[PDB]
Amino acid sequence: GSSGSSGTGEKPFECSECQKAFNTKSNLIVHQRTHTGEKPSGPSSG
Ligand SMILES: [Zn+2]
């Protein structure tokens, strides 16, 4: 039906809000901050 991730590796560091994959922690940490405030990029609306 709706294929997807049959067998894909994972990263040692993953976000908490968007759950994004990262190689280094430093890069991740800095990426976590961006997740602040409200409607930073734009609402989904569907
Ligand atoms: Zn994130």
Taking a 5 Å cut-off on Cβ, the residues next to ion ligand 1 are: 15, 17-18, 20
**CA 22–ligand 1 middle distance (angstroms):** 10
**CA 6–ligand 1 middle distance (angstroms):** 23
Segments forming the whole domain that contains residue 28: 11-46
Distances in Å between the Cα of 9 and the Cα atoms of 6, 25, 27, 38 are: 10, 17, 19, 32
Q: Would you say residue 25 lies in a domain?
A: yes
Number of domain units in the chain: 1
**CA 32–ligand 1 middle distance (angstroms):** 5
Q: Would you say residue 3 lies in a domain?
A: no
Amino acid identity at 22: F
Method used to solve the structure:
NMR
36: which 2 tokens?
């602040």
Residues facing 22 on adjacent strands: 13
- CA separation for the pair 14, 32 (Å, rounded): 10
Q: Would you say residue 2 lies in a domain?
A: no
